[PDB]
Copies of this chain bind each other. A is one copy, B any other.
Amino acid sequence: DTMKVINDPIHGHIELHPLLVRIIDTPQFQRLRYIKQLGGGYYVFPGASHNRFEHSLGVGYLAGCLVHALGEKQPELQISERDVLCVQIAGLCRNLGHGPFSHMFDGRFIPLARPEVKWTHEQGSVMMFEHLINSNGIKPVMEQYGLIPEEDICFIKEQIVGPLELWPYKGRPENKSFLYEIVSNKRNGIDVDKWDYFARDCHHLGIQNNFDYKRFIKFARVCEVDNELRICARDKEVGNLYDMFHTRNSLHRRAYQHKVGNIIDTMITDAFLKADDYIEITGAGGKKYRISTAIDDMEAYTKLTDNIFLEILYSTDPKLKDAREILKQIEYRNLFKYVGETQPTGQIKIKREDYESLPKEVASAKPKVLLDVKLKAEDFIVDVINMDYGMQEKNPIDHVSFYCKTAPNRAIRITKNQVSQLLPEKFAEQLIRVYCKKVDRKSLYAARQYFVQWCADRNFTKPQDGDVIAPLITPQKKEWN
């Protein structure tokens, strides 16, 4: 076994250590070739055909680039070849837990199918990783290349999911704290996973990426911060860091929360819910699982990919007829219709436990206009989207440490007002999208009247096309003019 070279359109020629090759060449990893990175986004942006497999390679490559760069500038950190490989493996493997259509699965489907469970792709990635190791005899190979499985497997998992329960980590001591900031940075979100998806998603979507990760790496150093060794950025890069999160938010607005990409994800989720009683996935010992339960058996989950969509679409079983019809409407582009978008005002914050009551509220609005049709709660979809800088209401830059050119070993803090007055004043907001399942002209007209009346009643912002779609409704609200 020697190193392999793979050619990636984002990163060029990437070298893979033979241990990494061994991990990659498994059913558990190769599974990621059948899971689209952007889910239903490929149905809106046709270049977004990329899958989680190639993203994962990229994350593993970049994790190696950052850790190598720190070691090379700062030999006194004692980064070992062992550390490098562990960080690469965590990078390669942090997407293992994703399900069909990526965020559709853990963002929409599992919360509706299994409301009692607390499932994340992160937790999935740990479980899949364990299963990958054990199923494929990876521990001896790890030993062969100088890893110590007990500690190092723990380290890899902690890099992916955080502490498995004072210094809370067991895989590495505080001396090496900075290593936990590479793959999945729990402190402020600045990690190599974002850097790959910014570049890769842009390349495929046909939108241009403004964040320069190579620059960031060149300016990164490790410094002591409150008795931990942490990654610090050069002071003057602070503007580029705000820009990084601004770029993330733009990509969410333009692509990852595109109103039609989201409705396609919703329709696919609906098909999956209707198919859940009838599709069977064979797991360990031949036992059968369903779409919603494959998360309980990694051998079954290994076989749970975007293929489920085609299995439903191509089915002839009359039990799958309702599921199959929904997917057929997607092929004909007979989609649920977008009604509009609004946002809460003031200190109003809509909680997850109130989401279900929203279609009911919309249908209870009493727009004072003549309507041909009356719509009911079940005719409406209301999608609430939390947009933020990765840390709820907090500014992630308040949780970044910097250094200055005159004293590169001294960590400092930089506040928002030390950077620019042109920066955001808030770091979290909610968008509310409404759609109608009745697609005819009269229903849609009515849906608009209810929607805008509901915005008015709730004191939400005026939809951008409010005056055009509901001219008789918007005058009543003085706050809108």
A303 an interface residue at 8 Å Cβ cutoff?
yes
Asked whether, in the complex, the Cβ of A464 is within 8 Å of the Cβ of B414, the reply is yes
A310 an interface residue at 8 Å Cβ cutoff?
yes
Given the known A-B contacts A15-B218, A249-B422, A424-B424, are A412 and B467 also in contact in the complex, defined by CB atoms under 8 Å? yes
Chain B residues with CB under 8 A of A26: 331-332
Asked whether, in the complex, the Cβ of A218 is within 8 Å of the Cβ of B5, the reply is yes
Given the known A-B contacts A54-B46, A412-B465, are A250 and B254 also in contact in the complex, defined by CB atoms under 8 Å? no
Asked whether, in the complex, the Cβ of A208 is within 8 Å of the Cβ of B210, the reply is yes
Highest count of chain B CB atoms <10 Å: which of A10, A42, A405, A420: A420
Given the known A-B contacts A314-B307, A464-B418, are A239 and B253 also in contact in the complex, defined by CB atoms under 8 Å? yes
Asked whether, in the complex, the Cβ of B468 is within 8 Å of the Cβ of A406, the reply is yes
A57 an interface residue at 8 Å Cβ cutoff?
yes
CB distance from A218 to the nearest CB of B (A): 5
CB distance from A441 to the nearest CB of B (A): 11
Which chain B residue has the least Cβ–Cβ distance from A22?
A: B333
Cα of A268 to Cα of B22 in the assembled complex, Å: 22
Given the known A-B contacts A7-B215, A239-B253, are A427 and B417 also in contact in the complex, defined by CB atoms under 8 Å? no
A410 an interface residue at 8 Å Cβ cutoff?
yes
Chain B residues with CB under 8 A of A370: none
A247 an interface residue at 8 Å Cβ cutoff?
yes
Binds B, one of A27-35, A101-109, A152-160, A164-172: A27-35
Asked whether, in the complex, the Cβ of B7 is within 8 Å of the Cβ of A206, the reply is yes
Which chain B residue has the least Cβ–Cβ distance from A286?
A: B316
CB-contact partner of A46 in B5, B21, B57, B250, under 8 A:
B57
A117 an interface residue at 8 Å Cβ cutoff?
no
Interface string of A5-17 (1 = CB under 8 A from B): 1111110110100
Cα of A287 to Cα of B451 in the assembled complex, Å: 48
Chain B residues with CB under 8 A of A316: 282, 286
Cα of A303 to Cα of B313 in the assembled complex, Å: 9
Asked whether, in the complex, the Cβ of B25 is within 8 Å of the Cβ of A332, the reply is yes
Chain B residues with CB under 8 A of A243: 250
A131 an interface residue at 8 Å Cβ cutoff?
no
Asked whether, in the complex, the Cβ of A422 is within 8 Å of the Cβ of B427, the reply is yes
Interface string of A404-420 (1 = CB under 8 A from B): 11110010101001111
CB distance from A324 to the nearest CB of B (A): 12
Asked whether, in the complex, the Cβ of B208 is within 8 Å of the Cβ of A212, the reply is yes
A311 an interface residue at 8 Å Cβ cutoff?
yes
Cα of A54 to Cα of B307 in the assembled complex, Å: 19
A194 an interface residue at 8 Å Cβ cutoff?
no
Cα of A126 to Cα of B154 in the assembled complex, Å: 57
CB distance from A245 to the nearest CB of B (A): 10
CB distance from A48 to the nearest CB of B (A): 9
CB distance from A455 to the nearest CB of B (A): 11
Asked whether, in the complex, the Cβ of B250 is within 8 Å of the Cβ of A210, the reply is yes
Given the known A-B contacts A47-B8, A235-B465, A464-B402, are A387 and B422 also in contact in the complex, defined by CB atoms under 8 Å? yes
Chain B residues with CB under 8 A of A214: 12-13
Q: List 8 A-B contacts (CB under 8 A).
A: A9-B204, A13-B214, A49-B50, A286-B316, A307-B311, A404-B469, A418-B461, A421-B425
7 closest A-B pairs by beta carbon, nearest first, are A9-B206, A9-B47, A404-B465, A46-B54, A25-B333, A210-B210, A307-B310
